[PDB]
Design an enzyme around this catalytic site. Sequence first.
Site, mmCIF file in Angstrom:
data_model
loop_
_atom_site.group_PDB
_atom_site.id
_atom_site.type_symbol
_atom_site.label_atom_id
_atom_site.label_comp_id
_atom_site.label_asym_id
_atom_site.label_seq_id
_atom_site.Cartn_x
_atom_site.Cartn_y
_atom_site.Cartn_z
ATOM 1 C CG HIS A 124 -0.525 18.398 -22.753
ATOM 2 N ND1 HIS A 124 0.049 19.560 -22.532
ATOM 3 C CD2 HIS A 124 -1.579 18.325 -21.839
ATOM 4 C CE1 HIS A 124 -0.566 20.183 -21.564
ATOM 5 N NE2 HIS A 124 -1.551 19.442 -21.140
ATOM 6 C CG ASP A 145 2.541 20.775 -24.706
ATOM 7 O OD1 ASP A 145 1.843 20.197 -25.519
ATOM 8 O OD2 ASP A 145 2.261 21.002 -23.547
ATOM 9 N N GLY A 164 -6.794 21.796 -17.080
ATOM 10 C CA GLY A 164 -8.027 22.365 -17.704
ATOM 11 C C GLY A 164 -7.696 23.690 -18.381
ATOM 12 C CB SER A 180 -3.475 22.057 -20.773
ATOM 13 O OG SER A 180 -2.824 21.667 -19.551
ATOM 14 N N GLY A 181 -3.201 24.494 -22.944
ATOM 15 C CA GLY A 181 -3.538 24.905 -24.307
ATOM 16 C C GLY A 181 -3.897 26.376 -24.363
HETATM 17 N N1 LIG Z 1 0.871 24.187 -12.445
HETATM 18 C C1 LIG Z 1 0.565 24.516 -13.674
HETATM 19 N N2 LIG Z 1 0.866 25.710 -14.130
HETATM 20 C C2 LIG Z 1 -0.092 23.584 -14.516
HETATM 21 C C3 LIG Z 1 -0.506 23.962 -15.827
HETATM 22 C C4 LIG Z 1 -1.155 23.087 -16.703
HETATM 23 C C5 LIG Z 1 -1.382 21.822 -16.235
HETATM 24 N N3 LIG Z 1 -1.952 20.820 -16.802
HETATM 25 C C6 LIG Z 1 -1.920 19.858 -15.935
HETATM 26 C C7 LIG Z 1 -2.461 18.581 -16.212
HETATM 27 C C8 LIG Z 1 -2.582 17.535 -15.242
HETATM 28 C C9 LIG Z 1 -3.130 16.248 -15.555
HETATM 29 C C10 LIG Z 1 -3.214 15.065 -14.565
HETATM 30 C C11 LIG Z 1 -4.326 13.906 -14.915
HETATM 31 C C12 LIG Z 1 -5.594 13.790 -13.995
HETATM 32 O O1 LIG Z 1 -5.599 14.237 -12.867
HETATM 33 O O2 LIG Z 1 -6.568 13.225 -14.468
HETATM 34 C C13 LIG Z 1 -1.775 14.472 -14.738
HETATM 35 O O3 LIG Z 1 -0.943 14.776 -13.901
HETATM 36 O O4 LIG Z 1 -1.554 13.753 -15.704
HETATM 37 C C14 LIG Z 1 -3.550 16.042 -16.826
HETATM 38 C C15 LIG Z 1 -3.430 17.023 -17.727
HETATM 39 BR BR1 LIG Z 1 -3.972 16.431 -19.434
HETATM 40 C C16 LIG Z 1 -2.919 18.270 -17.502
HETATM 41 O O5 LIG Z 1 -2.886 19.143 -18.572
HETATM 42 N N4 LIG Z 1 -1.344 20.149 -14.783
HETATM 43 C C17 LIG Z 1 -1.017 21.408 -15.016
HETATM 44 C C18 LIG Z 1 -0.370 22.239 -14.111
#
Ligand SMILES: NC(=[NH2+])c1ccc2[nH]c(-c3cc([C@@H](CC(=O)[O-])C(=O)[O-])cc(Br)c3[O-])nc2c1
Length: 223
Positions: A40, A84, A175, A177-178
Site C-alpha cells: 500500500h 501487503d 508514516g 507503514s512499510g
Molecule cells: N495503528 C497502527 N499500527 C497503524 C499502522 C500503520 C498505519 N498506517 C496508517 C495509515 C493511515 C492513512 C489515512 C490517510 C490520511 O490521513 O491521509 C487513512 O486512514 O487512509 C493512510 C495511510 Br497510507 C496509512 O498507512 N494507519 C496506520 C495505523
Amino acid sequence: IVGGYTCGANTVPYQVSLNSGYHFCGGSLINSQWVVSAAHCYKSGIQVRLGEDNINVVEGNEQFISASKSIVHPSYNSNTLNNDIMLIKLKSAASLNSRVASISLPTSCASAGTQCLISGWGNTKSSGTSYPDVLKCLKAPILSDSSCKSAYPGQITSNMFCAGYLEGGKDSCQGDSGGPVVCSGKLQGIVSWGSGCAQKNKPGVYTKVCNYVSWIKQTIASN
Ligand SMILES: NC(=[NH2+])c1ccc2[nH]c(-c3cc([C@@H](CC(=O)[O-])C(=O)[O-])cc(Br)c3[O-])nc2c1
Ligand SMILES: [Ca+2]
C-alpha cells in the site's frame, strides 16, 4: 510511532525512508540492492533514503538512490490489505557499512510473546499529526492469534499478526507503514495497518514475513 523513544542515529541500520519529495513510508534493506516495504506504499517516483536519522537535514551517512522497479505482491488486495508486501530494487547498490546494513529474513515464524523492535518516522500522536525529524523506536510483543482476532474479528488473515499493547499508548502509526518489525535479529513483520493509532484494544497489524520468504527469494532471483 506513538509512545516510542528516539532510536539514536544509525542504531537501526536497515531502516530506510521512502521519499517522493517528503517522507511517506518506511522499508527495510534486505541486501545491497533490495528493500522490502508494504504494497500500500506503492507509487512511482520513489527515492530510497538509507543511513538517515534526521530526515530534514543532511548530517552525513545518507545515501539517496532511486528505485529501479517496485514489485507489489500479485495477490495484494487493497481492500483487506492481505499480502501487503512489496519489493523495491534500487537503481545501484548501496554501500553497506555499520550505518547501512541489511537485516536477515526469518527461517521460522515468531511466537506470541516474542519482543520485537518497530521503528519509523510516522506520526507520534494518536490524536492529530506530529511527524518527528529523527527516527523513533518501540519495543512491542507479538500477540496471540486469539487476542488479534478478538480485536479485529473477520479482518485478520493468516498473513498477518498483531503486535503491541491492548492498553493503548504505544503503537506504530501512519508514516511508519512499510517499516520493519525485527525480533531476535530477523525481519518478522512489515508495518501494515490498525484502527487509529495506540487506541485501547486495537493493536497494530503487520504483514507476516515468514510466509513470504520463498516468494521474496524467487522474485529477487528472477529480477
Ligand atoms: N495503528 C497502527 N499500527 C497503524 C499502522 C500503520 C498505519 N498506517 C496508517 C495509515 C493511515 C492513512 C489515512 C490517510 C490520511 O490521513 O491521509 C487513512 O486512514 O487512509 C493512510 C495511510 Br497510507 C496509512 O498507512 N494507519 C496506520 C495505523
Ligand atoms: Ca538526514
